[PDB]
Nucleic acid binder design. Structure first.
Ligand SMILES: [Zn+2]
Lengths: 260, 67, 1362, 99, 68
RNA sequence: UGUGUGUCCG
């Protein structure tokens, strides 16, 4: 009687217990899915710091950029229109790009204003500076000739002809820099400038085993009076290292040389 | 006989009930900890974005009266 | 009588535009100015009647109508003007020549005697010493030309007076040359045979004015030609002659001292250089200065070539040679030079290149640049040069500007954090700077290596103001006796109406700073700040900004700016605020040489994240002013505004300058095409322009220097090197420390250091070019141990002598207020002291000074400009002619006793003296002993005390009450006060100068000296921090005779004229000297008799004076012994025992100080023969509460209270004595300041006021080369005989004595090793600890001061507390 | 004791059924909340990365600009400053570049 | 017998009450999750607004710079 | 009659 009734009531209770278990596992799997979908919320918590860093950096940079430019920033369209007629740059500053402005400069079609051209050339010419070539001079034939002339006493001396032939050989051989450097070093170490010129004509490898130049001469009027003691008859096989500076040839097949 | 089996069945059902209750409590604790981890830090990120939005709005307001 | 007083020295630019007027009056032809308006204008009332003068017509009766420029003739006049003519001056300057020589000889002898008395003297002296000096003086080349030029200068200076009608002319005929003068105009008549010719047959001077055919027709049969110039050329020539004579005399005399090798170049090479320069100028005209300007860089390169000669050391000389060759070839192409002239014109730089001298001789030769004259300036060329670089368009890189701004902010923050405790409480939403938050919370600062990624974070930092705008502690900056510009309303009223062609409608009233400062009704610092903050400088009447050409130089022209009065005040206030506000975060000084610093300290300083080798390079900042644009300097100006409480103050210049009209305010050439119709809107032409974008030199210099330092720091951060910067004059030197390991020898260290320096130079060039300023790589040079900077020259740690810059500027005549003799003698003495501070030869400078002193005395006695012609000062003031004996005696007693003596031999050892009175007494005693006139000491030192107040006592605490030792300052101050009485409606100065100011001054001065015992230095220190000091510093603003004789406000006070008072006081002063035995009493000599001690006699002399001030109270803290009297030397042999320390030192012994010589040589250039050429190893209390950004008044009250508390330590009146002084300065009451006063606890307050406070820095008067080779042991004194010994002066005396003793002998020839200085037991005393006691109180009402400025201020505690 | 046992069992069944219903309702609410993934998490996560990339690109590009100085910056700044305080155009005559 | 049955019924009722109170506490704490909903809605707008701002910024950068 | 012909910032 009552035992059977308790039996089916407890059976129903057990069934509802299985639906309780079903509900429990359903909510557990829902919580697991929520956790799986929510796990990518603490990952922006880190990259937001990098976002803040880059945003603040950009804010500072562009705020300072707009601070320096007044109320006449002269948008690019206005500048391009202003360049066409009365090509002077527009009032107020303007903004370009390095590559774009270089490209416009290298093309002879846009007719970039002259002032902008020279300003950009001045700005750009200083980027080719390295450890060397900072204070390095540029040396030509005439400059080296004048530098050598300033160190010698008197005029018309055979040393002047020696300097001239040395600078000519350096010019057509393209070795002036090393000659000047070692000449300056020799002049610094203490010897006489004539001894220095001897060092140039004896030490430079290019000057080794060289024949002196032949110069056509009219008469004794052309040759300076200070070198008449240095005229000598030419022997066969002249050599610069032997003491040859030049060869003078007359009209009537006369050849003479100078001895140092 | 029948009474003992019914008692055993009820005991097993109650054991399962308390086991799932403990599991639910553990899940509650873990989600409470997860929420606590996302309570103060999320406020910190919120105020940081507030500041960034304010400064960016100031910048664009400055830029607006230029074009 | 007159309101004119022409100067005796050249101090103005040379312009010859007005001469075109004179040539039009006489009928000649000349073209000096480029303004065509001067061709057909109207002549003034004067220089028009020149056609009515018989003398001018007679002079110009046999000369061609054509003339020549004067700049082609100056060398010709210099070479061909000896003294042989007939000058109108009656007493010729050559008449009193021999006497001068005699005096010179005497002085030399005295010096020798003095040295022989000290113990220095010389080894192996030569008997033939005076004869060589006499021959050298008599054998000078420029001896007679100097006297002739001085006669000419006297004539032209006298003739420039008589501004009224009926002017006269003077005439001089010197053999070949004829000179005529008429009111600041000179006509020179010269033969034509002396002018170099052209290839076309005309002189080189006439090429630019005439064609070949016209000039030949104009000349025809004539032998003389006439040139016209102003009176400034004559003064320039006189200065050139004096400089050449001084240089030649010094060079000749120096050879006698050291025949084998002297430090001066030569006496014959310099003559060749002078001749070469003169020839080059005579050929090339005024353009030869472009070549003369290369003397300094060539000498610098030649000095640069005295080292190991690395591969790049010769680059500078090569660049200079190329530049000078290019310029020489460029500036002569048009001129038709003959081949002979072409070869002979290069001799100048040919000689300069080929020189072979020691570096010291080259450094001495470096200082003769201005011995050839100065060019002729034009307005148009200067305007063209300024217009370029100022209207040019630039390109900028924003990233470099951003980094520079960040570095600026970082430097300011770092400087604030280093002092003032901790961070500055950054506001503004801290999360925007993540990375700096940790440092702020931990209260630390980033070191340096890690501040490279958080640099942008410094942009967001915000703060309250860090500095205050009420810290002006000196009121003399607002009144300085200068000139300003005029209002825009009457901008054209500064030009001559006759040249302008129209009378200006509106005229100005005054043009001087003092004549406008006193008439500003509402002047105040807060008023100035309000005026600046309201942008009130943009008003239509406040935009003039005139230009002005600079003084003597070698450029084509440099100009500075002049502003109206209120904008000038704003500029002065901004500079004052920046001087002591910002710019302390960017120090520009240091001057540290790695060869004279400790090894470990250098290593620690050079560490960024082992021997340290440093390099350096120098750059020039003079063109930076015109290269600054608003787009680059805007953020820095905004930040400077924000750091203070101001809004639009620091950007006045960038706001008001482009709106101005640029012109040069020259009296004789207004802007081109100026007419009455276009007066309100004048056009721009060759001498004017409208758009100016760059800066101006001088204005805002501190901000620009700060920006440069920020750029250097940015470069230092960018590249991992340690950089130090120094800025002075127009140059900045930057040194780089490289730090090297131990195993790297010493060969590649120099190469690596120079490589690092080149890297730094290239990076800095790139950065600065990106900022818009371009460096020139062809002039910047890199070296590894040679540094030249302002007044210092060092070569690998060895100081090079450079003393010709000051020794060659000595002159008998100088502007010293009404040609005062005392001022001239004082200037000569200071110049001699400064010159002897350098070099290693003593005799030449003293000989030159002695030569010039007597000449100045004579020329002032016979040719004073303040009186009429023929007036003799030395006759009527005495009744008899003044003789050599009286002058020689009156040039020997020192000035502290009233005796016109300033060449103290004691100064040869050290600069600042402990007690002038004792030193003067010793000098007089020694001089009187040298001659056999010993029985005159008492009558000479007795004198008669004068009448003086307590103010005079507190002005000079270490003085005496004799009328002969006073200056003209009191007279000028009385005149200024009298002028203020009937003027100065300023309404704020009037409050300060009330009716009873003088009585209050007297009461305060008397009260300060009522202590017991009486101390004068303490009273003088306290007196400067009261309203009395402010009144005194405002009163003393007069500086020149012209403003004294020409001021409208001063000369409109009726009463007796200033000129008569000046003549009377000059006569009285001249009567005071040279008289003798007329102003002495016979009551003090008995008291001074039988003393035989300088200290006691000086004390008695001081006590006898000021008798009416000090009734019977003792006087302390004013007397100190002379250093020579205290110590005696023995010059111990290396193997010898001291007689003093052994023979007579048995019972107790005598203390002494020891000097020993080192042996390490380190470095030497060029040799180690001389001691001066080598160097050696060996280096030569908190308050409870500190306020933040205190005002000037608060600070001054703080130290005043601290001093009063500390001096009266044993008394209980300190609570009441302080209050009356603070009632007029600060709003805080007593017992509130006391917690801010730092605690002090010491004794013997005399020593605190002597050295600890350091009123003088002492220092030495010799080169520091020898000091590194000696070691001084002072602990041997033991109980120190806490005493009267000043240790710094002892060290200086020992070093100087050793240096002078061995200055010509070789290093090996030195036979002495150790030196003993034994102290005598006569002039050394013991000082006790004494505290002043005040028995009364001031009880004076100082509450009436409730005004602005340095006076009582409200709410002083506004900056907060720490 | 049969009636009281039956009543107690029925009450227990009703209570457990109510528990099942409320658990199902909570499950449905959680599922509804998770339907959109709370909504903004994914697209704001993508937007954060996109913004970071854009800002980095702009910062990198900022290092390649060249500025040309104008001849009217000072006049414009002065006019703006004079308008900010006591707003009124500056007094005549006109400045260097009135534009 | 009957005593064991009634004792186990009482234990069942007690455990049922414990389960019910645990369930209602779980529901009360689940409905307290709306706090996590505050930094979801409003924050979204901020990010979106920030995006918009950045977007227009880029546009403005193309109106001033000359570029290619 | 030629306003003090000029002589500034450090
Ligand atoms: Zn001894």
């Amino acid at each position: 009687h009552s035992f059977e009734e308790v039996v089916q009531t407890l059976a129903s209770l057990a069934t509802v217990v299985q639906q309780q278990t079903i509900a429990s596992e359903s909510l557990e799997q829902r919580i697991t899915s929520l956790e799986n979908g929510l796990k990518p919320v603490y990952d922006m918590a880190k990259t937001i710091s990098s976002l803040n860093r880059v945003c603040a950096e950009m804010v500072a940079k562009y705020d300072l950029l707009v601070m320096t430019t007044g109320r006449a920033t002269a948008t690019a369209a206005a500048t391009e229109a202003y360049w066409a007629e009365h090509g002077q740059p527009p009032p107020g500053p303007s903004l370009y790009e390095e590559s774009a402005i270089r490209g416009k400069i290298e093309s002879r079609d846009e007719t970039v204003p002259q002032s902008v051209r020279e300003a950009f050339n001045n700005l750009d010419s200083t980027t080719s500076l390295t450890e060397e070539n900072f204070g390095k001079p540029d040396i030509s034939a005439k400059d080296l000739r004048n530098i050598m002339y300033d160190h010698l006493p008197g005029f018309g001396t055979a040393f002047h002809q020696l300097v001239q032939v040395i600078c000519k050989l350096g010019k057509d051989s393209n070795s002036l820099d090393i000659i000047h450097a070692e000449f300056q070093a020799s002049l610094a170490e203490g010897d006489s400038p004539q001894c220095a010129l001897i060092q140039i004509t004896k030490r430079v490898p290019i000057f080794q085993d060289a024949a002196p130049p032949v110069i056509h001469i009219r008469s004794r009027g052309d040759i300076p009076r200070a070198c008449q003691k240095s005229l000598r008859p030419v022997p066969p096989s002249p050599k610069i290292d032997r003491g040859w500076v030049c060869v003078f040839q007359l009209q009537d097949g006369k050849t003479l040389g100078l001895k140092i | 006989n029948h009474s003992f089996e019914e008692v055993v069945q009820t005991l097993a059902s109650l054991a399962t009930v308390v086991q799932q209750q403990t599991i639910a409590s553990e899940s509650l604790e873990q989600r409470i900890t997860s929420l606590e981890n996302g309570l103060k830090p999320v406020y910190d990120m919120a105020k940081t974005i507030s500041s960034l939005n304010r400064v960016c709005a100031e910048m664009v307001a400055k830029y607006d009266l230029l074009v | 009588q007159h309101t004119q007083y022409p100067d005796a020295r050249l101090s103005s630019p040379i312009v010859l535009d007005q001469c075109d007027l004179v040539t039009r009056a006489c009928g000649l032809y000349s073209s000096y100015s480029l303004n065509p308006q001067l061709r057909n204008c109207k002549l003034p009332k004067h220089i028009y009647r020149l056609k009515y003068d018989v003398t001018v017509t007679k002079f110009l009766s046999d000369v061609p109508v054509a003339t020549l420029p004067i700049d082609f003739i100056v060398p010709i006049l210099l070479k061909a003007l000896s003294g042989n003519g007939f000058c109108p001056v009656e007493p010729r300057c050559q008449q009193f020549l021999d006497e001068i020589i005699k005096y010179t000889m005497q002085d030399a002898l005295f010096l020798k005697y003095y040295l022989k008395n000290v113990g220095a003297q010389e080894d192996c002296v030569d008997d033939h010493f005076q004869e060589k000096i006499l021959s050298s003086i008599q054998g000078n080349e420029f001896l007679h030309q100097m006297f002739f030029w001085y006669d000419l200068a006297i004539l032209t200076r006298r003739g420039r007076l008589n501004r009224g009608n009926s002017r006269s002319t003077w005439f001089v005929h010197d053999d070949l040359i004829d000179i005529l003068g008429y009111g600041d105009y000179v006509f020179w008549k010269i033969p034509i045979s002396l002018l170099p010719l052209n290839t076309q047959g005309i002189p080189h001077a006439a090429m630019d004015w005439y064609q070949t055919s016209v000039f030949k027709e104009a000349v025809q049969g004539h032998t003389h030609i006439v040139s016209v110039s102003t009176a400034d050329v004559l003064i320039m020539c006189k200065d050139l002659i004096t400089c050449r004579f001084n240089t030649t005399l010094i060079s000749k005399i120096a050879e006698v001292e050291d025949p084998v090798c002297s430090d001066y170049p030569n006496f014959k090479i310099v003559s060749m250089l002078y001749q070469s320069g003169d020839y080059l100028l005579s050929i090339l005209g005024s353009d030869g200065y472009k070549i003369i300007k290369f003397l300094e860089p060539l000498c610098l390169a030649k000095i640069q070539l005295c080292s190991k000669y690395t591969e790049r050391k010769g680059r500078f000389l090569t660049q200079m040679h190329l530049a000078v060759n290019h310029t020489l070839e460029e500036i002569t192409e048009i001129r038709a030079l003959k081949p002979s002239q072409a070869h002979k014109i290069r001799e100048f730089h040919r000689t300069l290149i080929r020189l072979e001298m020691t570096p010291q001789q080259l450094c001495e030769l470096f200082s003769i640049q201005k011995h050839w004259g100065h060019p002729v300036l034009h307005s148009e060329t200067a305007i063209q040069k300024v217009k370029k670089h100022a209207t040019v368009l630039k390109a900028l890189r924003p990233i470099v500007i951003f980094e520079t701004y960040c570095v600026f902010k970082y430097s300011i923050a770092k400087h604030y954090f280093d002092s003032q405790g901790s961070w500055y409480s950054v506001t503004s939403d801290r999360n925007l700077t993540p990375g700096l938050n940790s440092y702020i919370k931990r209260n630390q600062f980033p070191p340096l290596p890690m501040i490279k990624e958080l640099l942008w974070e410094f942009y967001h930092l915000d703060h309250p103001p860090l500095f205050s705008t009420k810290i002006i502690s000196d009121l003399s900056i607002f009144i300085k006796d200068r000139a300003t510009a005029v209002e825009r309303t009457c901008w054209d009223a500064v030009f001559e109406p006759n040249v302008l062609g129209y009378n200006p409608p509106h005229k100005f009233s005054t043009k001087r700073v003092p004549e406008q400062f006193l008439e500003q009704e509402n002047f105040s610092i807060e008023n100035v700040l309000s005026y600046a903050q309201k942008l009130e400088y943009l008003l239509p009447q406040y935009r003039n900004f005139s230009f002005s050409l600079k003084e003597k130089e070698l450029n084509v022209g440099r100009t500075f700016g002049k502003l109206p009065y209120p904008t000038r005040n704003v500029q002065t206030l901004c500079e004052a605020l920046l001087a002591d506000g910002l710019a302390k975060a960017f120090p520009s000084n240091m001057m540290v040489v790695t060869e004279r610093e400790q090894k470990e300290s250098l290593l620690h300083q050079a560490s960024w994240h082992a021997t340290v080798r440093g390099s350096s390079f120098v750059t020039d900042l003079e063109k930076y002013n015109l290269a600054f644009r608003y787009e680059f300097t805007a953020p820095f100006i905004e930040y400077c505004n924000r750091c203070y409480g101001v809004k639009n103050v620091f950007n006045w210049m960038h706001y008001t300058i482009p709106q101005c009209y640029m012109h040069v305010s020259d009296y004789y050439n207004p802007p081109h095409n100026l007419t009455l119709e276009n007066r309100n809107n004048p056009p721009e032409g060759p001498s004017s322009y409208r758009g100016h974008m760059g800066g101006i030199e001088g204005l805002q210099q501190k901000l620009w220097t700060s920006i440069s330092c920020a750029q250097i720091s940015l470069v230092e951060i960018k590249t991992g090197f340690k950089l130090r910067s120094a800025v002075m004059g127009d140059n900045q030197c930057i040194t780089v420390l490289s730090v090297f390991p131990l195993e790297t020898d010493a060969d590649e260290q120099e190469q690596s250091a120079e490589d690092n320096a080149a890297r730094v130079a290239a990076s800095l060039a790139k950065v600065t070019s990106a900022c818009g300023i371009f460096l020139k790589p062809d002039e910047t040079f890199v070296h590894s141990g040679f540094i030249y900077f302002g007044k210092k020259q060092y070569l690998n740690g060895v100081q090079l002598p450079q003393s010709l810059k000051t020794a060659t500027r000595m002159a008998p005549l100088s502007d010293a207020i009404f040609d005062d003799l005392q001022g001239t003698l004082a200037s000569i003495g200071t110049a001699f002291e400064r010159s002897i501070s350098e070099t290693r030869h003593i005799f030449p400078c003293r000989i030159t000074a002695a030569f010039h002193t007597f000449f100045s005395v004579r020329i002032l006695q016979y040719h004073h400009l303040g009186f009429n012609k023929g007036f003799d000062l030395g006759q009527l003031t005495l009744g008899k002619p003044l003789d050599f004996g009286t002058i020689s005696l009156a040039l020997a007693v020192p000035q502290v006793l009233g005796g016109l003596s300033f060449l103290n031999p004691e100064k040869c050892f050290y600069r600042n003296l402990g007690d002038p009175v004792t030193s003067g007494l010793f000098q007089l005693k020694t001089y009187l002993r040298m001659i056999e006139m010993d029985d005159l000491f008492l009558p000479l030192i007795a004198k008669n005390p004068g009448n003086c107040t307590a103010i005079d006592f507190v002005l000079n605490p270490s003085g005496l009450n004799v009328p002969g030792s006073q200056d003209l300052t009191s007279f000028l101050r009385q005149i200024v006060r009298r002028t203020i009485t009937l003027s100065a409606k300023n309404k704020l100065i009037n409050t300060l100068f009330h009716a009873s100011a003088d009585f209050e001054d007297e009461m305060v001065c008397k009260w300060l000296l009522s202590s017991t015992p009486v101390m004068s230095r303490f009273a003088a220190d306290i007196f400067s921090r009261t309203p009395s000091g402010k009144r005194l510093q405002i009163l003393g603003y007069l500086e020149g005779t012209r403003t004294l004789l020409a001021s409208k406000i001063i000369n409109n006070n009726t009463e007796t004229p200033v000129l008569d008072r000046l003549r009377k006081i000059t006569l009285q002063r001249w009567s005071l000297w040279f008289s003798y035995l007329d102003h002495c009493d016979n009551i003090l000599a008995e008291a001074l008799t039988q003393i035989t001690c300088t200290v006691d006699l000086a004390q008695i002399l001081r006590e006898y004076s000021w008798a009416h001030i000090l009734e019977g109270r003792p006087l302390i803290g004013a007397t100190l012994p002379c250093m020579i009297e205290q110590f005696k030397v023995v010059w111990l042999k290396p193997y010898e025992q001291c007689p003093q320390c052994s023979n007579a030192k048995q019972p107790g012994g005598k203390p002494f100080v020891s000097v020993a010589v080192k042996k390490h040589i380190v470095s030497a250039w060029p040799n180690a023969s001389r001691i001066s050429w080598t160097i050696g190893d060996g280096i030569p209390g908190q308050p409870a509460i500190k306020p933040k950004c205190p005002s000037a008044a608060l600070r001054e009250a703080i130290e005043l209270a601290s001093r009063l508390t500390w001096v009266t330590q044993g008394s209980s009146n300190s609570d009441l004595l302080i209050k009356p002084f603070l009632e007029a300065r600060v709003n805080l009451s007593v017992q509130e300041i006391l917690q801010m006063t730092p605690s002090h606890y010491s004794g013997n307050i005399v020593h605190r006021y002597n050295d600890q406070y350091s009123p003088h820095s002492f220092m030495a008067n010799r080169m520091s080369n020898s000091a590194t080779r000696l070691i001084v042991s002072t602990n041997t004194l033991g109980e120190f005989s806490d005493s009267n010994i000043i240790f710094q002066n002892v060290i200086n005396y020992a070093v100087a004595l050793f240096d002078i003793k061995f200055r010509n002998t070789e290093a090996t020839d030195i036979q002495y090793n150790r030196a003993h200085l034994h102290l005598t037991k006569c002039c050394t005393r013991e000082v006790p600890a004494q505290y002043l006691t005040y028995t009364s109180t001031l009880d004076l009402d100082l509450t009436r001061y409730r005004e602005n400025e340095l006076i009582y201020d409200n709410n002083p505690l506004k900056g907060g507390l720490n | 004791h049969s009636f009281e046992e039956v009543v107690q069992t029925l009450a227990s069944l009703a209570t457990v059924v109510q528990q099942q219903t409320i658990a199902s309702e909570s499950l449905e609410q959680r599922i509804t909340s998770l339907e959109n993934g709370l909504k903004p998490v994914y697209d704001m996560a993508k937007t954060i990365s996109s913004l970071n990339r854009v800002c980095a690109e702009m910062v990198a590009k900022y290092d390649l600009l060249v500025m040309t100085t104008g001849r009217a910056t000072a006049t414009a700044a002065a006019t703006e400053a004079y308008w900010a305080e006591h707003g009124q155009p500056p007094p005549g005559p006109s400045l260097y570049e009135e534009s």
